[PDB]
DNA sequence: AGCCACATCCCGGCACTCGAAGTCCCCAACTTGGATGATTTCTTCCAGTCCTGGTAA
């Protein structure tokens, strides 16, 4: 009904109401997968405790699935889709309606993590994590901008395309084609703002 | 003006894009002069047989 908080240590304890609503919606689909039992009070009541160690737990949830994915590998990683390892955790960032990083704190932590992941895995002769392919709609989300802007950014040569398409065809938004390390670096280099 | 049957209608849901290099453009295509003569084109003999009318003196 209102916020009214002070000494807001948890990442769920600050902000405008729309964000506070979005954070709960996200928590629910992701951890309350059990079918509705109209436990309208009890089901959501737990979300606050959950977030109290967030700055240090979210990363472990992401780390766990890097390893479980790795041991099930069937192709060299540089032809593997980003989605096969992280399971659309990126798309879920779109459920909070705000676009910028300083307000959408879920996206802010996911990017933090991916930047570190790339940093500890530099390029060498054998491919490794960080060379995964992103689709056009994924870069748009990580770069905090609409899709048409990515097409314009490609056209000017600020980033490379890795898969050669056939002639008399087009690459659709859903096709996986940019390397992760290329997107992370470009964003640090030329996409920052006061937000 | 109040009550009832039947039309559709929009959100939540679901499923698909889809592997995976490109194979050269352009403009022209021939004019003149003649096609042969002299000769001849076969002859002997033969060319089946039997069955399958109606009507009135």
């Amino acid at each position: 009904y209102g916020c009214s908080f002070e000494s807001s240590n948890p990442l769920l304890a600050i902000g405008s109401l729309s964000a506070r609503f979005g954070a709960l919606y996200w928590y629910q689909q992701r951890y309350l997968s059990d079918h509705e039992a109209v436990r309208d009070d009890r089901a959501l009541t737990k979300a606050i405790g959950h977030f109290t160690a967030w700055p240090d737990a979210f990363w472990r949830e992401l780390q766990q699935m890097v390893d479980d994915a790795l041991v099930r590998q069937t192709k060299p990683l540089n032809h593997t889709d980003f989605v096969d390892v992280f399971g659309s955790v990126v798309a879920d960032c779109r459920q909070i309606p705000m676009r910028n990083t300083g307000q959408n704190f879920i996206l802010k932590n996911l990017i933090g993590f991916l930047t570190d992941l790339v940093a500890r895995h530099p390029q060498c002769r054998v491919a490794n994590v960080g060379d995964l392919l992103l689709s056009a709609v994924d870069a748009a989300t990580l770069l905090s901008t609409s899709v048409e802007q990515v097409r314009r950014l490609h056209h000017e040569g600020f980033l490379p395309l890795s898969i050669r398409p056939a002639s008399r065809n087009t690459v659709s938004p859903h096709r996986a084609v940019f390397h992760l390390r290329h997107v992370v670096e470009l964003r640090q280099a030329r996409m920052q703002s006061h937000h």
Side-chain angles (χ1 to χ4, degrees), chain A residues 1 7 9 16 27 34 53 62 67-68 102-104 107-108 118 130 148 157 163 182:
Chain A
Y1 79 85
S7 300
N9 286 339
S16 68
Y27 173 85
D34 290 347
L62 291 173
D67 291 341
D68 288 341
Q103 296 180 272
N104 181 321
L107 183 58
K108 184 174 182 179
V118 171
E148 193 64 25
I163 302 299
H182 279 317

Side-chain angles (χ1 to χ4, degrees), chain A residues 80-144:
Chain A
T80 296
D81 193 304
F82 180 83
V83 173
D84 290 341
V85 175
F86 291 94
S88 307
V89 70
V90 172
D92 287 345
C93 294
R94 296 294 301 275
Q95 291 182 347
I96 296 171
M98 304 169 300
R99 179 184 292 171
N100 68 50
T101 300
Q103 296 180 272
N104 181 321
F105 78 95
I106 296 297
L107 183 58
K108 184 174 182 179
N109 285 271
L110 180 59
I111 292 168
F113 174 81
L114 290 176
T115 298
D116 190 78
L117 180 61
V118 171
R120 288 179 282 109
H121 292 287
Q123 185 174 344
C124 64
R125 294 183 181 277
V126 58
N128 58 27
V129 66
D131 296 345
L132 298 171
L133 297 175
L134 297 171
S135 69
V137 298
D138 298 309
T141 300
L142 294 174
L143 297 177
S144 303

Side-chain angles (χ1 to χ4, degrees), chain A residues 13 39 41 46 74 80 91 114 124 127 139 167 173 177 181 187 195:
Chain A
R39 294 174 295 162
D41 51 356
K46 296 186 291 295
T74 61
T80 296
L114 290 176
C124 64
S167 67
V177 298
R181 70 175 62 253
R187 192 183 197 284
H195 297 276

Side-chain angles (χ1 to χ4, degrees), chain A residues 126-170:
Chain A
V126 58
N128 58 27
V129 66
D131 296 345
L132 298 171
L133 297 175
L134 297 171
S135 69
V137 298
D138 298 309
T141 300
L142 294 174
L143 297 177
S144 303
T145 184
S146 67
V147 170
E148 193 64 25
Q149 183 59 25
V150 174
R151 290 172 61 83
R152 285 190 287 267
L153 196 60
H154 172 258
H155 283 302
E156 296 297 329
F158 285 96
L159 62 80
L161 182 67
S162 293
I163 302 299
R164 292 173 296 180
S167 67
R168 299 299 303 275
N169 212 313
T170 186

Side-chain angles (χ1 to χ4, degrees), chain A residues 143-145 149 153 185-193:
Chain A
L143 297 177
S144 303
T145 184
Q149 183 59 25
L153 196 60
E185 288 184 353
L186 185 155
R187 192 183 197 284
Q188 289 181 306
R190 65 188 302 108
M191 301 297 288
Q192 297 185 54
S193 70

